[PDB]
């Protein structure tokens, strides 16, 4: 409201900076105190700040995370909210926006001179309006106030020509009718800082650590937690993260990338089940994916029926995943030897061996090539269904009610699809 309290606050700020640099320098002689107070104690420091606001730039998307010998145009722009559904971005950052600072590592003090809360609001939004308390609290003269306001508000607007350096990325995009756009991307350091802050609360917050301790104590808690596995660290600055930006000095490197990985990103090995009796209960069932699927079926089998059919839809989808993995198992059985099924052995699951090794029809001209064609083995999934019958809960309440009927119906449908898949293996 009053200009006098803003003047008192900025004089207190420059006095705090003066006593801080006096304590840091610790000078007792050589006239260092007079030279320190001759440039950071009066309005001329604000004039000195006029030499510092033109060097700094307040941005939300910068180019300096891309190769640091590139000099482009870092721009502060909030992207428009897309009309298409189901996709995010930096447009989702509304009032939860932190604006990055780029420039020198010594002018950055004036950033807090643009980020104080004197009247209860940020001073950049105070200087974007022609307020009555504005242009009098910092300058007695009108024209000095106007040029100081223009220089102090120019930290948001992009300086120089619109430019992207050669070391920056530029990627052509095909237009629908006969065109291209060059589309240079910038690093969303505000969005990355927001995601890194959310991950900090998720992994090292007090409530998250309390929920982790409650999980470790196996007790109840009013809220849950998360883990965020397989995170990747991408440090931008090698020696001086402060040279990248101020937000990259807050989080020193550590881009904290999310694991967008395919399910076969941790392919262990391919193994041939030689001296074993059944593939589904001894080798295929011990893989961790179908292990989590079978524990999920065990959890979903003994449950209430209030969301039943919807849960059953999920259950149907769940059971589909398991037979998918069975095909996936057969898929990596295409990566093995052509004739592993013809090796000697007392028990090697010969009922499943017509589907386990499809390439032995190349090995044997008529000993076993015509056997898979004439037999058309599709009953093996029924054996797998028997293994899937070990994935259900041993509850008599499901058998008494129609839950077992729905389970048998979706099981019959999915193994009908599995048997139809296994039928046309000869093509």
């Amino acid at each position: 409201p009053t200009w006098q309290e803003l003047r008192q606050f900025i004089e207190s700020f420059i006095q705090e900076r003066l006593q801080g640099k006096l304590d840091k320098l610790q000078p007792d002689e050589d006239d260092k105190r007079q030279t320190l107070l001759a440039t950071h104690r009066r309005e001329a420091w604000l004039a000195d700040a006029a030499r510092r606001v033109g060097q700094l730039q307040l941005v939300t998307h910068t180019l300096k995370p891309i190769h640091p010998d590139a000099r482009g145009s870092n721009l502060h722009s909030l992207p428009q909210a897309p009309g298409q559904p189901g996709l995010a971005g930096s447009h989702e950052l509304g009032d939860r926006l932190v604006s990055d600072v780029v420039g020198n590592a010594a002018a950055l003090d004036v950033f807090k001179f643009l980020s104080l809360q004197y009247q209860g609001k940020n001073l950049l939004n105070w200087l974007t309006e022609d307020s009555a308390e504005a242009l009098q609290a910092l300058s007695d003269n009108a024209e000095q106030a106007r040029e100081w306001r223009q220089a102090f508000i120019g930290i948001t607007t992009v300086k120089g020509a619109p430019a992207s350096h050669s070391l920056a990325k530029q990627l052509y995009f095909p237009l629908p009718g006969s065109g291209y756009h060059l589309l240079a991307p910038l690093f969303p350091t505000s969005l990355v800082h927001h995601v890194h802050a959310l991950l900090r609360e998720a992994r090292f917050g007090d409530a998250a650590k309390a929920a982790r301790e409650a999980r470790s104590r196996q007790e109840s808690w009013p809220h849950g937690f998360s883990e965020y596995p397989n995170l990747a660290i991408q440090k931008f600055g090698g020696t001086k993260p402060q040279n990248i930006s101020q937000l990259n000095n807050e989080r020193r490197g550590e881009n904290w990338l999310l694991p967008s990985l395919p399910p076969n990103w941790q392919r262990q090995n391919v193994n041939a089940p030689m001296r074993h009796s059944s593939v589904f209960e001894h080798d295929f069932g011990r893989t961790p994916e179908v292990s989590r699927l079978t524990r999920t079926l065990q959890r979903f089998l003994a449950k209430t029926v209030h969301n039943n059919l919807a849960i059953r839809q999920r259950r149907a989808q769940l059971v589909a995943q398991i037979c998918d993995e069975a095909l996936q198992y057969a898929a990596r059985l295409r990566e093995l030897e052509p004739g592993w099924s013809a090796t000697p052995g007392c028990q090697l699951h010969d009922a499943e061996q017509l589907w386990l090794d499809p390439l032995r029809a190349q090995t044997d001209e008529t000993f076993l090539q015509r056997r898979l064609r004439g037999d058309w083995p599709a009953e093996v999934g029924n054996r797998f269904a028997n293994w899937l019958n070990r994935a259900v809960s041993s509850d008599s309440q499901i058998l008494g009610s129609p839950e077992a009927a729905q389970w048998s119906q979706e099981l019959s449908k999915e193994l009908t699809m599995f048997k139809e898949i296994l039928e046309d293996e000869r093509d």
Binding site: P79, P82, G86, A88, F173, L258
Partner: protein
């Protein structure tokens, strides 16, 4: 934007050092925009001479290996780096952390045009395969399968089937070819409905938080894990406008002074990896460009999926 008249199966392609950092927020499998741009570069280089159009790519990703390591004492991971050459004064240059990944993917390409009636299917298939064998897919060289046991040619299958059963058998055989992999599809509808579910759970929740909730493992107190419909990776869903579309000669140090440049920001969506037998047709897996250049929104998606 159109139904493909044929589907061309580029086989197992071993991409050597692909860009593992797909996005400023995600790492791992590369962007689908890289695959769509590769198919458009294939159409730009050899598609026009064959009188065909190549739009829409379905990714299977038969193998993934990340050049990463886990340091001791941390549950996160770091990227293995390459030693860049020294500067002119003999000192080590500043390191830009770039991650690499060895991929093995097979691509379904949507082919439409009169040239399908002008050439044999194996001829245009072999031409686009030998063009693609000297290109890059996500920043990595493509290993063109020299001196192994049995090389894999393409199989261009015409989607204009004479009968529904023959078309079904063709699609099931083409799915059987690309079996040890996972189709990566776009899930804008699932992410939007999960955003609505979270907004009913708690208001003023952004799409970023709904995307994050569909990727972290949520632990619920009675201690169980909140399940997910699929793999539900966070993918780069395209590019949104960050600047007005400047003139082709306006932007300093552009790639070319004939293409207009516009500064963009990455768009993040939800993708899903599925077993490819769980789709009605293999043309649903095709990743299509969608520009909408008046409003930014330079997206890639899988239209006609469900």
């Amino acid at each position: 934007v159109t139904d493909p008249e044929a589907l061309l199966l580029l086989p197992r392609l071993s991409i050597q050092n692909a860009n593992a950092i797909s996005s400023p927020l995600t790492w791992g499998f590369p962007s689908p925009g890289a695959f769509t741009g590769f198919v458009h570069a294939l159409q730009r280089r050899v598609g026009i001479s064959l009188d065909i159009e190549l739009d829409g790519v379905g990714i299977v990703c038969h193998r993934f290996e990340a050049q990463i390591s886990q340091p001791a004492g941390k549950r996160t991971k770091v990227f293995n780096l390459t030693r860049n050459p020294l500067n002119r004064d003999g000192s080590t240059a500043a390191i830009v952390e770039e991650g690499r990944a060895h991929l093995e993917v097979s691509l379904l390409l949507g082919v439409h045009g009169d040239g399908l009636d002008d050439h044999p299917a194996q001829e245009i298939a072999r031409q686009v395969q030998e063009q693609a064998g000297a290109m890059r897919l996500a920043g990595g060289s493509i290993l063109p399968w020299c001196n192994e046991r049995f090389p894999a040619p393409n199989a261009e299958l015409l989607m204009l089937g004479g009968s529904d059963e023959q078309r079904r058998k063709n699609q099931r055989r083409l799915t059987r070819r690309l079996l040890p992999g996972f189709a990566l599809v776009s899930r804008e509808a699932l992410l939007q409905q999960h955003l609505e579910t979270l907004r009913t759970t708690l208001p003023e929740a952004t799409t970023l938080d709904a995307l994050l909730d569909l990727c972290r493992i949520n632990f619920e107190p009675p201690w169980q894990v909140r399940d997910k419909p699929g793999w539900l990776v966070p993918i780069p869903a395209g590019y949104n406008a960050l600047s007005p579309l400047y003139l082709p000669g306006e932007v300093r140090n552009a790639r070319d002074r004939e293409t207009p440049l516009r500064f963009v920001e990455n768009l993040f969506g939800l993708g899903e990896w599925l077993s490819p037998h769980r789709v009605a047709a293999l043309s649903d897996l095709l990743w299509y460009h969608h520009a909408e250049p008046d409003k930014g929104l330079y997206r890639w998606s899988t239209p006609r999926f469900v």
